[PDB]
Design a protein around this motif. Structure first.
Motif, PDB file in Angstrom:
ATOM      1  N   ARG A  79       0.826  -1.204   0.000  1.00  0.00           N
ATOM      2  CA  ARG A  79       0.000   0.000   0.000  1.00  0.00           C
ATOM      3  C   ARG A  79       0.861   1.254   0.000  1.00  0.00           C
ATOM      4  N   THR A  80       0.420   2.261  -0.749  1.00  0.00           N
ATOM      5  CA  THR A  80       1.094   3.550  -0.777  1.00  0.00           C
ATOM      6  C   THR A  80       0.069   4.622  -1.110  1.00  0.00           C
ATOM      7  N   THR A  81       0.331   5.831  -0.628  1.00  0.00           N
ATOM      8  CA  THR A  81      -0.469   7.003  -0.949  1.00  0.00           C
ATOM      9  C   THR A  81       0.236   7.818  -2.020  1.00  0.00           C
ATOM     10  N   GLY A  82      -0.501   8.183  -3.058  1.00  0.00           N
ATOM     11  CA  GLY A  82       0.079   8.934  -4.156  1.00  0.00           C
ATOM     12  C   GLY A  82      -0.929   9.868  -4.776  1.00  0.00           C
ATOM     13  N   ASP A  83      -0.418  10.911  -5.429  1.00  0.00           N
ATOM     14  CA  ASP A  83      -1.259  11.909  -6.088  1.00  0.00           C
ATOM     15  C   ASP A  83      -1.400  11.556  -7.569  1.00  0.00           C
ATOM     16  N   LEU A  84      -2.144  10.482  -7.814  1.00  0.00           N
ATOM     17  CA  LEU A  84      -2.336   9.999  -9.171  1.00  0.00           C
ATOM     18  C   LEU A  84      -3.195  10.974  -9.973  1.00  0.00           C
ATOM     19  N   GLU A  85      -3.160  10.806 -11.293  1.00  0.00           N
ATOM     20  CA  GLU A  85      -3.860  11.647 -12.261  1.00  0.00           C
ATOM     21  C   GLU A  85      -3.444  13.111 -12.185  1.00  0.00           C
ATOM     22  N   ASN A  86      -2.310  13.408 -11.552  1.00  0.00           N
ATOM     23  CA  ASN A  86      -1.743  14.749 -11.428  1.00  0.00           C
ATOM     24  C   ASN A  86      -2.684  15.737 -10.751  1.00  0.00           C
ATOM     25  N   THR A  87      -3.752  15.260 -10.119  1.00  0.00           N
ATOM     26  CA  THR A  87      -4.615  16.124  -9.332  1.00  0.00           C
ATOM     27  C   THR A  87      -4.102  16.210  -7.900  1.00  0.00           C
ATOM     28  N   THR A  88      -4.616  17.193  -7.160  1.00  0.00           N
ATOM     29  CA  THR A  88      -4.206  17.369  -5.773  1.00  0.00           C
ATOM     30  C   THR A  88      -4.700  16.248  -4.869  1.00  0.00           C
ATOM     31  N   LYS A  89      -5.602  15.399  -5.350  1.00  0.00           N
ATOM     32  CA  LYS A  89      -6.128  14.320  -4.529  1.00  0.00           C
ATOM     33  C   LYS A  89      -5.060  13.265  -4.271  1.00  0.00           C
ATOM     34  N   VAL A  90      -5.105  12.674  -3.082  1.00  0.00           N
ATOM     35  CA  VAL A  90      -4.195  11.606  -2.684  1.00  0.00           C
ATOM     36  C   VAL A  90      -5.017  10.337  -2.517  1.00  0.00           C
ATOM     37  N   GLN A  91      -4.665   9.303  -3.275  1.00  0.00           N
ATOM     38  CA  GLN A  91      -5.407   8.051  -3.303  1.00  0.00           C
ATOM     39  C   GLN A  91      -4.603   6.962  -2.609  1.00  0.00           C
ATOM     40  N   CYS A  92      -5.253   6.233  -1.708  1.00  0.00           N
ATOM     41  CA  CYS A  92      -4.630   5.105  -1.023  1.00  0.00           C
ATOM     42  C   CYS A  92      -4.787   3.870  -1.901  1.00  0.00           C
ATOM     43  N   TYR A  93      -3.704   3.461  -2.561  1.00  0.00           N
ATOM     44  CA  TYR A  93      -3.762   2.450  -3.606  1.00  0.00           C
ATOM     45  C   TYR A  93      -2.707   1.378  -3.378  1.00  0.00           C
ATOM     46  N   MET A  94      -2.658   0.430  -4.313  1.00  0.00           N
ATOM     47  CA  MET A  94      -1.710  -0.680  -4.298  1.00  0.00           C
ATOM     48  C   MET A  94      -0.591  -0.401  -5.291  1.00  0.00           C
ATOM     49  N   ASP A  95       0.647  -0.410  -4.806  1.00  0.00           N
ATOM     50  CA  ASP A  95       1.816  -0.193  -5.649  1.00  0.00           C
ATOM     51  C   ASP A  95       2.485  -1.540  -5.886  1.00  0.00           C
TER      52      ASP A  95
END
Ligand SMILES: CC(C)CCC[C@@H](C)[C@H]1CC[C@H]2[C@@H]3CC=C4C[C@@H](O)CC[C@]4(C)[C@H]3CC[C@]12C
Ligand SMILES: CC(C)CCC[C@@H](C)[C@H]1CC[C@H]2[C@@H]3CC=C4C[C@@H](O)CC[C@]4(C)[C@H]3CC[C@]12C
Lengths: 291, 306
Positions: free
Chosen positions: B152-168
């Motif tokens: 698990r990692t948190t990242g700002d995907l789609e270059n938006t300011t949102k941070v998504q808790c996803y699977m890396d």
């Protein structure tokens, strides 16, 4: 001076482990005991342990905060929750110690009126009012604590914002008022009432001069350790405020600033020292260890 | 291309509202059922009771993290609690799933060695203790959910300011072989969370049902409550676990399968739209168990009277 590297985070982590283990064990001791055997001081001991535990669960977050050169990655909610639990620990602990000392005053000095007071008010009600009062008094921390990237250094700092209720001009007044009220409610007034109880206990015990001594010795050791662990924090904080108000020399201000982290560290260490104090003095805690 | 437009119609705040409701109800009910099982005498405490307590503890550990998921859903999928709490919350979801299914399997197998053969129940209790069994299942759940904690990692995907808790999966596989790791993790999770545990549960239940039909040679509705109670409550728990988690596993497996077989685009869009609600029901199960306990097995209901 003495940047110290990772001394503060290491001590925070050690206090986390030892406080969690010891407070869990003391809770196991108090709850495993029979309700008939359950003494009045036991509920206050359990509440003290619960306060210490609730603090040490958040202690790893403070360790990570210190290790990262004061950068908080857990968000606003956990900043509020951790600061609030810190103040809840302080207030509930000093209130439980006050309750224990008042109970010793009721028993050792004048047990007859103690019987009537026990008939009027039960221990559970005392614990309930104690905890709700601690929560209410720590509410200003939760309401005012916030998360911000001060100094524009991409570092998040968990700090108390007084711009929510006060302007820039009165921010000093609000900060000083909250600090002085916190000191008066967490150290000064409780220590005053505990010292009065202990003074009358000392006079009645001169007149008396082991069964009472067991509980009195453990409670006085707890209170003296609480004093030695929290007097530095309150003293440095109040002295810094009075230095700001009365323009004390800047060398002494720097000394207070550099000694503040260590005073906070000892105030946190008290939570972990409580179980070893129980183990060294209280024979029942040793019994639990053997059993 | 043609599909992947949107997720049906906007749910508004329905998912966060249900998350908060499940948090409140699960916390209260699971705490009360833990109080019930723990206040009962240790000698009186049955073998099923310790699995019940483990089930309640798993539900509690999940519902404490549920408010964070409600906040995550409310803020258009933005995670402000950090990578550590992303790992902890997802790991606790998977620990809840695995521990709950393992406890249900243990309860079903306990009923199996109780009804199908009463003689070997004592011998199998001597071979393996109940507390040993729960410790083994809990460590197994922790180890099986460890890949979730690691990946698990948190990242700002789609270059938006949102941070998504996803699977890396990049930390354990390359971009080309990320699909292999994702499909392997998903299929293994399904296999050891739904498929195999429900297979052994169904085998135990099949032999249990045959043994009971031995007495019920003729059609007789209802059962002798004295021996029925535990089986009835465990069967309703298993059926509700199936009804709450089978949608999630089914949609997950169907999406992973269509990643190869290439289902029609509309069906893939339908699965994507329905996934949040399947997750929502799977989360509802945790709070649902206490109300089931308050309806069957008069232990829980009498506990309230006392
Ligand atoms: C980083 C920030 C923005 C996250 C904000 C999270 C907020 C919305 C969430 C986090 C945990 C939540 C709390 C969790 C538990 C309780 C106790 C319950 O009896 C009433 C609701 C209450 C008080 C919730 C209120 C909303 C809450 C504070
Ligand atoms: C946002 C990121 C940077 C924060 C990371 C925080 C890390 C360093 C902290 C947060 C809480 C910590 C954990 C808290 C409790 C335990 C249980 C203990 O028995 C072993 C250590 C362990 C497992 C800690 C490991 C370090 C830990 C995971």
């Amino acid at each position: 001076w003495k940047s110290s590297g990772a001394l503060i985070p290491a001590i925070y982590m050690l206090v986390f482990l030892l406080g969690t283990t010891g407070n869990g064990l003391v809770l196991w001791t108090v709850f495993r005991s029979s309700r008939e055997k359950r003494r009045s001081a036991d509920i206050f001991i359990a509440s003290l342990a619960v306060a210490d535990l609730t603090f040490v669960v958040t202690l790893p977050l403070w360790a990570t905060y210190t290790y990262r050169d004061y950068d908080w990655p857990f968000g606003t909610f956990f900043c509020k929750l951790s600061s609030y639990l810190i103040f809840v620990n302080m207030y509930a602990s000093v209130f439980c110690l006050t309750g224990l000392s008042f109970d010793r005053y009721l028993a050792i000095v004048r047990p007859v009126a103690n019987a009537r007071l026990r008939l009027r008010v039960s221990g559970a009600v005392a614990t309930a009012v104690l905890w709700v009062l601690a929560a209410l008094l720590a509410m200003p921390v939760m309401v005012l604590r916030t998360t911000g990237d001060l100094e524009n250094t991409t570092k998040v700092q968990c700090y108390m914002d007084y711009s929510m209720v006060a302007t820039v001009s009165s921010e000093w007044a609000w900060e000083v008022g909250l600090g002085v009220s916190s000191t008066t409610v967490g150290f000064v007034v409780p220590f005053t009432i505990m010292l009065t109880c202990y003074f009358f206990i000392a006079q009645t015990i001169a007149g008396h001069f082991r069964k009472r001594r067991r509980l009195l010795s453990i409670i006085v050791v707890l209170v003296v350790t609480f004093a030695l662990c929290w007097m530095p924090y309150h003293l440095v904080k109040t002295l810094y405020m009075l230095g700001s108000l009365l323009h004390w020399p800047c060398d002494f201000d720097l000394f207070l600033m550099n000694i503040f982290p260590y005073c906070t560290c000892i105030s946190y260490v008290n939570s972990c020292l409580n179980p070893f104090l129980y183990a060294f003095f209280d024979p029942r805690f040793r019994q639990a260890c053997t059993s």
